[PDB]
Design a protein around this ligand. Structure first.
Ligand code: CO
Length: 115
């Protein structure tokens, strides 16, 4: 599995693999933004941002939001497109309902090495 839940509360903030912190773009929560906090790197490292789907085909397979890298250490950044047919914004089929009613939905995201 290995996914981190990132909740659709505008002030939510998580960390993936101890490498990248995540926040929302704005109160509309249309996309996550990323910042590298994984230490200084002798060479730039790249990771693919995997996101789960909650509905539709192949629920067992991750999609990608794009890539992040260790040069994203000074400014929050959007994931860099693959794209190709890659989703820029959060849609219903990324959203999982809270385990307890009355509380925000979440998306499931994680990093894998870009290879
Ligand atoms: Co990938």
């Amino acid at each position: 599995e290995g996914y981190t839940r990132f909740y659709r509360s505008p002030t939510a903030s998580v960390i993936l693999s101890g490498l990248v912190k995540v926040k929302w773009d704005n109160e509309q929560m249309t996309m996550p933004l990323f910042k590298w906090i994984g230490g200084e790197q002798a060479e730039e490292l790249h990771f693919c941002v995997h996101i789960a789907h909650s509905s539709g085909p192949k629920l067992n397979r991750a999609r990608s939001l794009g890539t992040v890298n260790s040069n994203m250490d000074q400014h929050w950044a959007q994931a860099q497109r693959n794209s190709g047919a890659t989703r820029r914004t959060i849609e219903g089929f990324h959203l999982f309902e809270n385990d307890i009613p009355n509380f925000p939905d979440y998306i499931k995201i994680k990093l894998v090495p870009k290879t």
